[PDB]
Homo-oligomer: A and B are copies of this chain.
Amino acid sequence: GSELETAMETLINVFHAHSGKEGDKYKLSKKELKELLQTELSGFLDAQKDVDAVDKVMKELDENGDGEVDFQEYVVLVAALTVACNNFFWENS
């Protein structure tokens, strides 16, 4: 009943909807990835400042070297990004 329980569900709930837009829901594509980070984290991840950076980000996600990113790869990185988001807050003071 904790908020975290809701959050794990939240990640999947957003993933299911967004991934469905293209290809397999279970598989995340670079476009979808760009759109998820860009739209959900337009501020913290504001990729617009550096479009090239998207490729750099995907490269880290593709452990396989396949060139395509899996949700499993995505979840590991998002955990790091949320923490990184705090850095932005630190800028405030």
Q: Which residues of A contact B (CB under 8 A)?
A: 2-8, 10-14, 36, 39-41, 44, 71-72, 75-83, 85-86
CB of A9 to closest CB in B, whole Å: 8
- Is the Cβ of A2 less than 8 Å from the Cβ of B82? no
How many angstroms between the C-alpha atoms of A2 and B36 in the bound complex? 9
Q: How many copies does the complex hold?
A: 2
Chain A contact residues, majority secondary structure = helix
- Is the Cβ of B5 less than 8 Å from the Cβ of A7? no
Counting chain B CB atoms within 10 Å of each CB, the highest count among A3, A6, A8, A81 belongs to A8
Q: Determine the chain B residues whose CB is within 8 A of the CB of A8 once the complex forms.
A: 41, 44, 81-82, 85
Q: Determine the chain B residues whose CB is within 8 A of the CB of A81 once the complex forms.
A: 8
